[PDB]
Write a protein that binds this DNA or RNA. Sequence first.
DNA 1: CGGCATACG
DNA 2: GCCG
Length: 325
Amino acid sequence: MPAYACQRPTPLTHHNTGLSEALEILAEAAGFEGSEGRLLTFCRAASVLKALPSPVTTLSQLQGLPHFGEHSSRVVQELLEHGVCEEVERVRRSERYQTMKLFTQIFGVGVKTADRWYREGLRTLDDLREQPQKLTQQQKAGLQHHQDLSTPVLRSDVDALQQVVEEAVGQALPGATVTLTGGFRRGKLQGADVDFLITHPKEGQEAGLLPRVMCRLQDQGLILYHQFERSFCIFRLPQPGSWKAVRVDLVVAPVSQFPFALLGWTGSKLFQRELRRFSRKEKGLWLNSHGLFDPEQKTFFQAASEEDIFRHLGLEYLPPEQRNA
DNA sequence: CGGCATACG
DNA sequence: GCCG
Ligand SMILES: [Cl-]
Ligand SMILES: [Cl-]
Ligand SMILES: [Cl-]
Ligand SMILES: [Cl-]
Ligand SMILES: [Mg+2]
Ligand code: NA
Ligand code: NA
């Protein structure tokens, strides 16, 4: 089992779901306390289990697996023995965990804001609604739309949004293309949001594109909220006899950078962190969603595909469905 | 022990 | 919290 998640296939569904979900609770809790190091280890340990070819049934099967030390091993041991881990259950029950989760789930609210509100004694969404003067416009939107945004987005919803985005993109810039990215591209059947990557086959034609797109969507009455290369929107999605709010991200990249942007927006988040870490630490190359830089030669690697990028990094190719770290 | 991904709004 |  290799040490980096980008070195191993990680399918969407796997054989250790319970164990990984427990470790990811501890990861999430670590994040709420600002311990990014511990969050990463628990995330990585969870991801290792997702990559295994069968269920862990005994503690000895953890021997030699990367990112499993005393703490993660004890978590698994307790789950194997008793079906629950006391530490995990304690986190789940805690007012701190439950409230930070509730607050950080709000669009416009991060760990730092949530934590300050927690310390001020706030606990519920209605606590936040009672004092709207203390909210940003983004947070006000996140709070107004919070119920709909908590409802899973379905693959049928995605098909409908894509058609709508293509229509606006087509008027904004003929020949421009729309690619579904993020979790739905990795094969998820549901999600919390929808991600699209927009480009044009003629380098440079994509400049100034996103404002034109946003203006056209807004004129069609489809935009409930928006704030450039990236747009974080709330869309009005038609429903039977009504509609619901859905988070949609739109991203534009020049076609020269498209493979990097595609790779970068297809995720998973942990996969991208691990891939960038691998690139820099193992290969001495600097990766981001725009390119891959060799800081010795001071040159950028030209990629024509994601396949190119994996090859340049000396990694076997992983399709999106195997990037579910 | 240092490091932990890397951007944009 | 774990790895190198
Ligand atoms: Cl608590
Ligand atoms: Cl409507
Ligand atoms: Cl170059
Ligand atoms: Cl980036
Ligand atoms: Mg997404
Ligand atoms: Na948030
Ligand atoms: Na998104």
